[PDB]
Design a protein around this ligand. Structure first.
Ligand SMILES: [Mn+2]
Ligand SMILES: [Mn+2]
Ligand SMILES: [Mn+2]
Ligand SMILES: [Mn+2]
Lengths: 198, 198, 198, 198
């Protein structure tokens, strides 16, 4: 059974960058629903699979990708943030960012560009391309997860669904992007990067 | 030059169903941006068309559908609402709804179902199918407009992008759907229906 | 385990409308590959689901929909055709057609148009909408199956992938559509209709 | 007005790798139809844009991308091939390849895989990412053009629509891919590369 992970910090720990109301709803309501809905969807698919009902399996795909991706995405997202986040990464991760994007600041502009560019709901990602052996930026629609749909290993995700910023930044998504850099947990992003170090 | 239409009522005229803050931002900020961005996009396409630059024309499609659809959708939406809305339609429109959906209440449940079912950003629509000569319910993603992408003539649209309800109803989209029925301008929906009366 | 069904007739039974080379290749190579790949994909999904590996489940969706859809679609297609087919249907089906499309000829026009309209690979379908309780024509891309993706019940499908007609009709898909009417198994289409209209 | 370019060689010049019947049909019928439909669609767009008819502009997008993309893609494809082609490229291009893909053979493996991987109709491409300043392989569905939809610059395209190989290789797309390497115009691919790498 999939389960809702606890936040690594309190709901108001990312203030004033992301306020407590957004965090509380985002975790206890939005993420929570994806987990429960994912479990329900998985149970329906085992039944469909057991009966060899291909039509049912296909009909369940949107729910599985949506709720499953929702669980995958938010689980990573919480770990990507920290009250003591911000600044820049060091060592290998930093060198890779410099190598692949020119400089840390350029990288921030490129991931900001990808995140602000999402039309409708979605996510901006810094991922790792195993085949090419380098970092790569990508944007995903709705809850479509990065690895499941592109093969890239997620390192840092920026949720740009309106439920992630509208209460506080209203329609000005760039203000939200501006603020989130202050709470990025580069320690976690570095750990995920080193995890694909092969 | 496309322009931002004035609202047919004040920003707080739909209270308590849709609060003033949502309306003020939705119209003066969200719709406004689509109009300006649409004008910019159209100007780029005339240049691309004049030079016969097919690649540029294709690259501009997402911006044109997104901002153009945004303008089309919101323009219709404002006219679909009224402080003195609610209740049920009469005459032909009502008979068609009964004929095509069984009853007015069933119709409300079906359009509610379509609207709540949108994964991510989008719209729920009651449209008119000219070929079949009957009403039809459809859901559209992001700002993809009803007529431009399905051929159905829009009669009533329900915006389910989070910027349309999150500030007030948070993650509970069904509460928003529950409330909006109280401000539907059936007089306008009837006018649009009679407009395809041929 | 899914299996390749035998054709209900000889590979050259549909001559001269659909030649024997196309039929033999379509059944013994094309459909067979979808069956094989479906079995492979389904088993990978069994493992992924057992491990609660959401990323793997999602990554397998394109292969499951494509190959699963391929199996569903071609299985129905073989039964929709017959060496003694052609002409028009009778009874309730014919009544539904004239009623929902005006006449049999207008119906041919609509389904032909939907099939010829597919850009790229896909299928044209005459289906049954259990919700509205009436017939409905739809087009599906690649191997996306009718019921699994639209909820409509398949009654008659027209495969417009190039492998279904290139060898014989070359780029003239309209000639292929005109010819296929001569081999439609209306008896089978009637069964499928009476089956969901109980 | 867009025009159908003459082929840079005889229809049977690529024998036995791609037969003359496929070449003649592909150029004189398939590509020709895209050109004709593109001109028709572009003119309708001129009218729609002049009237500020956003709905019509949006409704025309599928036809413009499909036919416009068709023209762009096939125009490049003819130049990427040659009767005296085959072998490997030299100089900077070859350096970029081994560098970005490991070796020429690994590159063939990657592009072949991308091309054979297309489910339904589409293209496999070796492109140039001006942003990262390196080569990049991508697959595009139907006639969606490489630059217009991904921003990457096309260097070499492999058409994997069934009309490009069914007549000769039947359902065995891998045999088609193996054969096409013998006619790649590396001289042309080099030009396109040096052109965007200025
Ligand atoms: Mn979220
Ligand atoms: Mn809106
Ligand atoms: Mn087929
Ligand atoms: Mn082609």
């Amino acid at each position: 059974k999939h389960s809702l992970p606890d936040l690594p910090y309190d709901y108001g720990a990312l203030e004033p960058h992301i306020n407590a109301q957004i965090m509380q709803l985002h975790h206890s309501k939005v993420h929570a629903a994806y987990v429960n809905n994912l479990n329900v969807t998985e149970e329906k698919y085992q039944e469909a699979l057991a009966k060899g009902d291909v039509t049912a399996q296909i009909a369940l795909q949107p729910a599985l990708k949506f709720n499953g991706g929702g669980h995958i995405n938010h689980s990573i997202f919480w770990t990507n943030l920290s009250p003591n986040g911000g600044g820049e990464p060091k060592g290998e991760l930093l060198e890779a960012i410099k190598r692949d994007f020119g400089s840390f600041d350029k990288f921030k502009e490129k991931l900001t560009a990808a995140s602000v560019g999402v039309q409708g709901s979605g996510w901006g990602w810094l991922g790792f391309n195993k085949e090419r052996g380098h970092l790569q930026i990508a944007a995903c629609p709705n809850q479509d997860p990065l690895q499941g749909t592109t093969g890239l290993i997620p390192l840092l995700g920026i949720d740009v669904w309106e439920h992630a910023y509208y209460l506080q930044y209203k329609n000005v998504r760039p203000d939200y992007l501006k603020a989130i850099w202050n709470v990025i947990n580069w320690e976690n992003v570095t750990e995920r990067y080193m995890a694909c170090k092969k």
